Automatic annotation (TrEMBL), chain G:
The name this protein goes by in its record: Small nuclear ribonucleoprotein-associated protein
Sm domain span: 1-81
Ranges in a coiled coil: none
Span of the entire protein shown here: 6 to 91 of 231
Protein family: Belongs to the snRNP SmB/SmN family.
Subcellular location: Nucleus
Gene: SNRPB
Length: 186, 77, 95, 74, 73, 81, 86, 81
RNA sequence: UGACCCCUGCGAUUUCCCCAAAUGUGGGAAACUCGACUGCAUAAUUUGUGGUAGUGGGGGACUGCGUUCGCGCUUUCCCCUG
């Protein structure tokens, strides 16, 4: 028959006569709440984050950024250059950054254990005014075919500043995929 | 060319007591002053009255809402 | 939807705070639940998983219904799969 | 009387007592908890009415949208 | 979302069939892709022989089953 | 589009039968067909669930509310089949 | 989706939501499950209200039929396709 | 989604109920996104009818009421995806 | 049916370099082009998330109205049937 002309001899009833659940104190099994390949990953993800964070506190107490033998000269005078090509000769780095002013001392950092060039150096100008002239001009320079950035070294100037390994620093060349453009420079 | 959306908007501004038929129910009808409507055709009334053809009793409901799928036919006053 | 991007997580927050959260806390706490379906029968059992379509994964269920004097009839199903469209009402353990 | 769409109206009914009648006569009155984009209603301290008369007390009740007939406050 | 080709029945007296064995009769004035029709000079045409004219009304396509044109278009 | 839809579009202009969810069966000449199964017919013969029949001149029916359709058997020779 | 492709042209019996059985040559289908049946015949089971009599079967020939998937419940092979060989 | 889990039950035995009260017990061979399932070597039992064993049956998803799965099914392991 | 061993999957088209039995047979790169492959608009009226619920039938005793005495409606208990 049709849905409209169908004589419902026993239409849908309520549920008032069908409340026979279990008592409250009869609680559910506590151990029956877990999932695989969902929490063990988060558990391992939390430790690696915390383990480093705990390791960070130990390094700050032992090593002092300001009290560094390599670092020398006035902090506001010194300059920082990174993304430098490994083949850049010391004279090439002097002659390219001397255009903005005379360089009192230049320090190219090297790997402690491997000895390889780190790729960034610290340039100390004779006058504080000579450095600032390079801050705007040096940034974006092209040395040995690879673009280089230049910013005042904040390791001993900016309060609450720290490098990558301590969670700070700048630049996102290795941040979330498709979130930091490689063309843009500091 | 007048469309149902524009016509429903007119009845709303006029605040006329629009009667509505139910889906699968011929015996039951509802009438009230429409307040608003969405793309889903759901209609809200300020003072609804449920009238049955057999019983002829008008049950007062007040400010209520009605599903669009249940609507079958609109009628003025 | 309001968020046409494929990375939209509207369904996520909906089951956590929306009306469908009754099933999440049931599977979380492993609490029983009574469901009224279009079969005029009531199904009392636990839930193990669900989605937006209101399709639950039940276990240890007990079907109950009545025919006609009115006689009651009940049976048991340890594992079954309930559809959403046929559902009318759901009721968790009010305790 | 400014136009009041159906969605804000139902949103205001949240937390207050509301009665809903189903397509098969049965009704349910309880404290509206929340709704979804499809109007899947969830009530609290719900009481089931059968053929208009009170049937019993249920509590928290989750009801789909395509089954309810209409909704009304109080 | 192609709409129905109801231009023929525009401004014609039709008799529509509804879901719950209900029928109406009026002149069509406009339609929509969802078959939402607005007919004027509509009669209720209840189960009994009684007739009740109200005029302009609206019908939801979800409930329209069949529509016949008494004026043969 | 779907193959059943194409078999319906090519069937336009011929006598076809259509049954609705309300039980009515309509047999007459087909005028217009659409991808959404909306069919327009002319001079059809309707059969109600009780068995009574009636006369119509020009009729249109929604596609979603059709149970099934009967088309001429000769359509089986279509190139797709 | 060879589950359906493998059955094209076979004599399948379609089960309707109302309880009817449409037996015809399954020609083609679609994503919506709208089938095309050739030489279809409609059967329906009528309850005996007079006495305990055998179920009454009322056959009805239709020919070519187009069934909407929404109204189709299930379908099985009643028999192989009409063999064209002698 | 959840229908993907339904498509993983091929070759296993279950008992599905239909919206018309019909019960169908057989082995699953394939399922689609629309919940339509194909069962081979299946037995159908219509309401007030006699059981019949069918070698194949393709059912639509709309007319399905619920399923009955085995007792030893690994839900915690099968619901990971 | 099938262990072991191979590709993680494209039908078509375009350009660079290279192996080469050198116009063919192949490899390393992308380019943006069709398929109805998938996700969301797809549970908001037209199929992929229900107003097609399945809610009975029959054999004995057991009421009434009309009656063509076959029956339509209507009120009860025990049984077979799903």
């Amino acid at each position: 028959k049709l849905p409209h002309e169908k004589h419902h001899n026993q239409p849908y009833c309520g549920i008032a006569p069908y409340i026979r659940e279990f008592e409250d104190p009869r609680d559910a099994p506590p151990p029956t709440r877990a999932e695989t390949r969902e929490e063990r990953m988060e558990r391992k993800r939390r430790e690696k984050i915390e383990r480093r964070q705990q390791e960070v506190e130990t390094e700050l107490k032992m090593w002092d950024p300001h009290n560094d033998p390599n670092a020398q000269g006035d902090a506001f005078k010194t300059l920082f250059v990174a993304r430098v090509n490994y083949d850049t000769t010391e004279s090439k780095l002097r002659r390219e950054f001397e255009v903005y002013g005379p360089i009192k001392r230049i320090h190219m950092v090297y790997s402690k254990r491997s000895g390889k060039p780190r790729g960034y150096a610290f340039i100390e100008y004779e006058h504080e005014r000579d450095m600032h002239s390079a801050y705007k001009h040096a940034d974006g320079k092209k040395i040995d075919g690879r673009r280089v950035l230049v910013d005042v070294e904040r390791g001993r100037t900016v309060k609450g500043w720290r490098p990558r390994r301590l969670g700070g620093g700048l630049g996102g060349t290795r941040r979330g995929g498709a979130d930091v453009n490689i063309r843009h420079s500091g | 060319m007048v469309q149902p959306i524009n016509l429903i908007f007119r009845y709303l501004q006029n605040r006329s007591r629009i009667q509505v038929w139910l889906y699968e129910q011929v015996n039951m009808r509802i009438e009230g002053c429409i307040i608003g409507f969405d793309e889903y055709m759901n209609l809200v009334l300020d003072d609804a009255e449920e009238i049955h053809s057999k019983t002829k009793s008008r049950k007062q409901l007040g400010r209520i809402m009605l599903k669009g799928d249940n609507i079958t036919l609109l009628q003025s006053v | 939807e309001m968020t046409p991007e494929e990375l939209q997580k509207r369904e996520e927050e909906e089951f956590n705070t929306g009306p469908l959260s009754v099933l999440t806390q049931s599977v979380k706490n492993n609490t029983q639940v009574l469901i009224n379906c279009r079969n005029n029968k009531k199904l009392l059992g636990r839930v193990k998983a669900f989605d937006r379509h209101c399709n639950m994964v039940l276990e240890n269920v007990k079907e109950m219904w009545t025919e006609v004097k009115p006689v009651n009839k009940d049976r048991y199903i340890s594992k079954m799969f309930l559809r959403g469209d046929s559902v009318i009402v759901v009721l968790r353990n009010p305790l | 009387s400014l136009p009041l769409n159906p969605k804000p109206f139902l949103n205001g009914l949240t937390g207050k007592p509301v009665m809903v009648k189903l397509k098969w006569g049965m009704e349910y009155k309880g404290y509206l908890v929340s709704v979804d984009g499809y109007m899947n209603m969830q009530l609290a301290n719900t009481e089931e009415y059968i053929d208009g008369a009170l049937s019993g007390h249920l509590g928290e009740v989750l009801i789909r949208c395509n089954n309810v007939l209409y909704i009304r406050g109080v | 979302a192609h709409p129905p080709e109801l231009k023929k029945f525009m401004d014609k007296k039709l008799s529509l069939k509804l879901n719950g064995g209900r029928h109406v009769q009026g002149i069509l004035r406009g339609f929509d892709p969802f078959m939402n029709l607005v007919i004027d000079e509509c009669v209720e045409m209840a189960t009994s022989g009684q007739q009740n004219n109200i005029g302009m009304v609206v019908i939801r396509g979800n409930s329209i089953i069949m529509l016949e044109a008494l004026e043969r278009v | 589009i779907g193959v059943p839809i194409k078999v319906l579009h090519e069937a336009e202009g011929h006598i076809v039968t259509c049954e609705t969810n309300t039980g009515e069966v309509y047999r007459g000449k087909l005028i217009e067909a659409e991808d959404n199964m909306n069919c327009q017919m002319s001079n059809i013969t309707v059969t109600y669930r009780d068995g009574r029949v009636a006369q119509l001149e020009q009729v249109y029916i929604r596609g979603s509310k059709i149970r099934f359709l009967i088309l001429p058997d000769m359509l089986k020779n279509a190139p797709m089949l | 989706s060879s589950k359906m492709l493998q059955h094209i042209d076979y004599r399948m019996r379609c089960i309707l939501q109302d309880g009817r059985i449409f037996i015809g040559t399954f020609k083609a289908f679609d994503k919506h499950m709208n089938l095309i049946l050739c030489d279809c015949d409609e059967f329906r089971k009528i309850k005996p209200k007079n006495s305990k009599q055998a179920e009454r079967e009322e056959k009805r020939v239709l020919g070519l039929v187009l069934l909407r998937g929404e109204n189709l419940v299930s379908m099985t092979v009643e028999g192989p396709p009409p063999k064209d060989t002698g | 989604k959840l229908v993907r889990f339904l498509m993983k039950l091929s070759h296993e035995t279950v008992t599905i109920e239909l919206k018309n009260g019909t019960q169908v017990h057989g082995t699953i061979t394939g399922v689609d996104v629309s919940m339509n399932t194909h069962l081979k070597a299946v037995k159908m039992t219509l309401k007030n009818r006699e059981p019949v064993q069918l070698e194949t049956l393709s059912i639509r998803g709309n007319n399905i009421r619920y399923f009955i799965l085995p007792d030893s099914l690994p839900l915690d392991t099968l619901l990971v995806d």
